[PDB]
């Protein structure tokens, strides 16, 4: 499914993401656009053989079982496939757990490099939230 900016924003808000662990909605939309361009199916390798899945590019090295990732754990006790459905719910649940890992949203390379410390609310905006 490829979301537009606002569609995902409402979706993320509906799912409880504006200010989950103090991260406003704009943070969650920002990071998705740069992790996955809002493509719920987006997948990417990682140089270590792990794989990033879904709207927030959630990594099989730790967080989901894709059955083919060396030194990997399945901390969200979910198959990486579940992060790809047009339903963002699996992705949101794992990322709620990921952000409470104590690293916060720095879990997301793109959020840290391209969202952190910017006016993130410019991502929701003009959106019928
Ligand atoms: Ca934090």
């Amino acid at each position: 499914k490829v979301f537009g900016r606002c569609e995902l924003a409402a979706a993320m808000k509906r799912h409880g993401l504006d200010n989950y662990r103090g991260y406003s909605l704009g943070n969650w939309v920002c990071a998705a656009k740069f992790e996955s361009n809002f493509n719920t199916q987006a997948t990417n390798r990682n140089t270590d053989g792990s794989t990033d899945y879904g709207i927030l590019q959630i990594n099989s090295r730790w967080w989901c079982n894709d059955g083919r990732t060396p030194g990997s754990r399945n901390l969200c006790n979910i198959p990486c496939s579940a992060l790809l459905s047009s339903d963002i719910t699996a992705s949101v649940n794992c990322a709620k757990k990921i952000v409470s890992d104590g690293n916060g949203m720095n879990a997301w390379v793109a959020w840290r490099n391209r969202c952190k410390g910017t006016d993130v609310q410019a991502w929701i905006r003009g959106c019928r939230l």
Side-chain angles (χ1 to χ4, degrees):
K1 183 178 179 180
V2 178
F3 285 74
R5 197 156 59 70
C6 306
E7 209 211 323
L8 203 24
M12 297 183 133
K13 187 29 171 147
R14 179 274 208 213
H15 276 92
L17 272 194
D18 200 336
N19 285 113
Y20 191 86
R21 274 276 212 148
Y23 290 93
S24 54
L25 206 52
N27 302 116
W28 295 101
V29 172
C30 179
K33 148 117 217 157
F34 296 120
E35 285 293 340
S36 65
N37 209 357
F38 293 163
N39 196 334
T40 87
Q41 337 240 16
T43 67
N44 291 281
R45 298 292 180 85
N46 296 114
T47 58
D48 67 311
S50 81
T51 301
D52 287 353
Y53 295 91
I55 217 76
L56 284 161
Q57 287 300 273
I58 290 174
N59 191 315
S60 63
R61 185 179 322 130
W62 291 97
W63 291 95
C64 64
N65 158 54
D66 68 4
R68 44 117 38 223
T69 298
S72 70
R73 283 134 280 232
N74 177 10
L75 292 185
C76 282
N77 184 237
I78 278 304
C80 299
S81 47
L83 306 167
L84 302 188
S85 52
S86 324
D87 181 8
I88 74 187
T89 284
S91 275
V92 172
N93 270 58
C94 194
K96 286 206 174 103
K97 167 176 211 353
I98 292 168
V99 85
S100 324
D101 185 37
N103 255 296
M105 285 207 81
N106 298 288
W108 285 276
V109 177
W111 173 93
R112 182 181 143 66
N113 289 330
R114 318 187 53 183
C115 295
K116 179 177 212 166
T118 72
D119 183 280
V120 288
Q121 185 269 352
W123 287 105
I124 77 188
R125 180 182 293 176
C127 296
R128 314 191 221 91
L129 304 127

